Amino acid sequence: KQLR
Amino acid sequence: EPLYPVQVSSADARLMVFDKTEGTWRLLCSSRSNARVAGLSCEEMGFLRALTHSELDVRTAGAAGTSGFFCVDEGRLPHTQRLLEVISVCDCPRGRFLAAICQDCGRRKLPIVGGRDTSLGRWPWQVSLRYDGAHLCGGSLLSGDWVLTAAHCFPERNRVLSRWRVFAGAVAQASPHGLQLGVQAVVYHGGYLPFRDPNSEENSNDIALVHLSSPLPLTEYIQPVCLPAAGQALVDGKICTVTGWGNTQYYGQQAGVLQEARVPIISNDVCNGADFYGNQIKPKMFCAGYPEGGIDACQGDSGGPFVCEDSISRTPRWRLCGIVSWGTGCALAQKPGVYTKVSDFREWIFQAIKTHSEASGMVTQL
């Protein structure tokens, strides 16, 4: 769950 | 597909509203509330706002495919969000009706992992948000001076507005033929928890507005994108397009040339399943991608457009239905891209631009  | 109940003529900008009892189209009788009726109508249809409005005379303008008039309840109008709820059939004796020039959007004016190089003018709303010379996020033009992007593009270290620049009108990052303007203000969603607590894992409300220091001229390479119309649903399975200059592979570099990729919308039921994101897809978020992976957005694409084309306004238009937000790696099987559901923030957008029309700096807004 990594922000873009 | 089914047309939108509110329409605007390309011939003379007359507003036309569907009468479900007759299956006919009616004109809007002129009233002292023309300004707000025009504004609400444009917003309802997915346009950002009404630039101007005027009166037309049926005696010299004709009815042009309409059968009668609708009158606006000027007592109920101030307390409503839907135009259809405050209108009723009327005679409109003097025959003067409302025309509104909504800000055109979503149309081309030309004569990312697993995507391909795109060309100039294909996605004229795409902009590059750069801080101290590094491309960090995408954004979508809603007008010549307002850009919709993601709130996470503004962490603590990237908040000095004088150090941000918005690059438009070109697909090659190193092109000296685009236009690059400064930033006057950034209105971020007050419900985006990680803004104040970067350690927070709750990413809902990943959305923000960027007001440019001056307006960009609208050309065949720079155009605003439309917003979903009021009540317009996100259709599961529909294939839309996502664009950006982000990494072309998670461990790869950013694209020198803007990339485009087509990805289908995935249902919440599927995306929140254990094999996918396991209850992590919260309200106002949605997934798009392939169960097989291979094609997806990635770092550097956040804030960028996820657009879907439709003809509900009687002409093909692209609408900003999602904003690139997050995912687990990039292009992994069963780990599609997650996007902010733009339709769920329509009112937030309209009101933020009104409330902070000339504000400066970083501004929070619930």
The CATH number of the domain where B21 resides is what? 3.10.250.10
The CATH number given to whatever domain includes residue B321 is: 2.40.10.10
Angle at B98 between CA B97 and CA B104, to 5 degrees: 150
The span from the CA of B320 to the CA of B343, in Å, is: 9
For residue B276, give how far its alpha carbon lies from the nearest alpha carbon of chain A (Å): 11
Could you tell me if B168 and B127 are in contact, meaning their C-beta atoms sit under 8 angstroms apart? yes
Q: Calculate the alpha carbon distances from B147 to B1, B96, B99, B301, B346 in Å.
A: 29, 36, 27, 15, 14
How many residues are present in chain A? Answer: 4
SS3 for B132-159, per residue?
CCEEEEEEEECCCCEEEECHHHCCHHHC
Contact yes or no for B337 and A4 at CB 8 A: yes
Structure tokens at B335: 């780990």
Q: How far apart are CA B10 and CA B26, in angstroms?
A: 16
Active-site residue flag, B152: yes
Residue B250's domain comprises 112-123+225-341
Whether B248 and B329 map to the same domain: the answer is yes
Residue that has been written with the tokens 């005027």 in this structure: B54
Same domain, B215 and B233: no
Six-digit token pair at B47?
A: 């346009």
A-chain residues within 8 Å CB-CB of B335?
Answer: none
List the one residue out of B119, B59, B67 whose CA is nearest residue B89.
Answer: B67
- Which residues have a C–N gap over 2.5 Å right after them in chain A? none
Number of domains in chain B: 3
Q: If you ran DSSP here, which 8-state letter would residue B125 be given? A: T
> Of B363, B362, B300, B366, which is closest to residue B159 (Cα–Cα)?
B362
Contact B14, B97 (CB under 8 A): yes
Token duo for residue B7: 């329409």
Where among B104, B136, B170 does a domain terminate? B104
* Continuous segment of H or E residues that includes residue B45: helix B34-45
Q: Which residue of A has its CA nearest to B328?
A: A1
Burial class (CB in 10 A: 0-12, 13-18, 19+), B85: exposed
**Residue B145 and residue B99 in one domain:** no
- d(CA B36, CA B83) in angstroms, rounded, equals 10
Minimal C-alpha gap between B18 and chain A (Å) = 41
CB contacts under 8 A, A 1-4 vs B, are 1-4
Report the C-alpha gap between B242 and B258 in whole angstroms: 11
Residue in B150, B299, B326 closest to A1 by CB = B326
Residue that has been written with the tokens 């036309």 in this structure: B16
Which uninterrupted H or E stretch holds B35?
A: helix B34-45
Contact A2 B150 (CB under 8 A): no
Contact B250, B330 (CB under 8 A): yes
Q: Is B206 a catalytic residue?
A: yes
- Number of Cβ within a 10 Å radius of residue B9: 18
Q: What is the DSSP string of B283-312?
A: TTEEEES-TT-S-B--TT-TT-EEEEEE-T
Nearest-angstrom CA–CA distance, B114 and B273: 24
Q: CB B332: neighbour CB atoms within 10 A?
A: 16
Residue B253 to residue B215: CA distance in whole angstroms: 31
* Range B279-300 burial, b when 16+ CB lie within 10 A, else e: ebbeebbbbbbbeebebbbbbb
Question: Do B219 and B234 share a domain, yes or no?
Answer: no
Q: Would you give the distance in Å from CA B193 to the centre of its chain?
A: 23
For residues B11 and B93, state if they share a domain: yes
Instruction: Output the furthest CA–CA distance in chain A (Å, rounded).
Output: 10
- Indicate whether B237 and B335 sit together in one domain: yes
CB contact under 8 A, B150 and A1: no
Q: Collapsing DSSP states into helix, strand and coil, what is residue A2? A: strand
Using CA atoms, how far residue B5 sits from B19, B48, B93, B226, in Å, is 8, 17, 24, 17
Identify the DSSP state of B281.
Answer: -
Q: Where are the alpha helices (DSSP H) in B46-143?
A: 58-61
Nearest to B231 by CA among B51, B77, B84: B84
Q: Exposed/middle/buried for B119, CB within 10 Å: 0-12, 13-18, 19+?
A: exposed
Same domain assignment for residues B92 and B172:
no
> Does the active-site annotation cover B302?
yes
Q: Which of B57, B47, B46, B78 is nearest to B14 (CA)?
A: B57
User: In terms of domains, do B210 and B350 share one?
Assistant: yes
The technique by which this structure was obtained is X-ray
Which residues contact residue B160 at a Cβ distance below 8 angstroms, ignoring those fewer than 6 apart? none
Last residue of a domain, one of B74, B104, B134: B104
User: What is the CA B288 to chain-centroid distance, rounded?
Assistant: 17
Amino acid, res. B209? L
Residue for token digits 């072309």? B248
Pick from B284, B268, B267: which is nearest to B339 by CA? B284
Per DSSP, chain B holds a count of helices (H) and strands (E) of 4, 22
b/e per residue B183-205 (b: at least 16 CB within 10 A): bbbbbbbebbbbbeeeeeeebbb
Q: Are strands B259-266 and B116-117 parallel, antiparallel or unpaired?
A: antiparallel
Q: Are B324 and B302 in contact (CB under 8 A)?
A: yes
DSSP B201-267: ---TT--EEEEESSPPPP-SS--PPB-PPTTPPPPTT-EEEEEESSBSSTTSPBPSB-EEEEEEEE-
Q: What's B103's DSSP letter?
A: P
Sheet with B6-8: list strands edge to edge: B6-8, B15-19, B24-28, B69-72, B87-90
Q: Give the integer Cα–Cα distance in Å for B123 and B307.
A: 9
State the first-to-last Cα distance of chain A, in angstroms, to the nearest integer. Answer: 10
Residue B94, CB-side half-sphere exposure with 13 Å CA sphere: 10
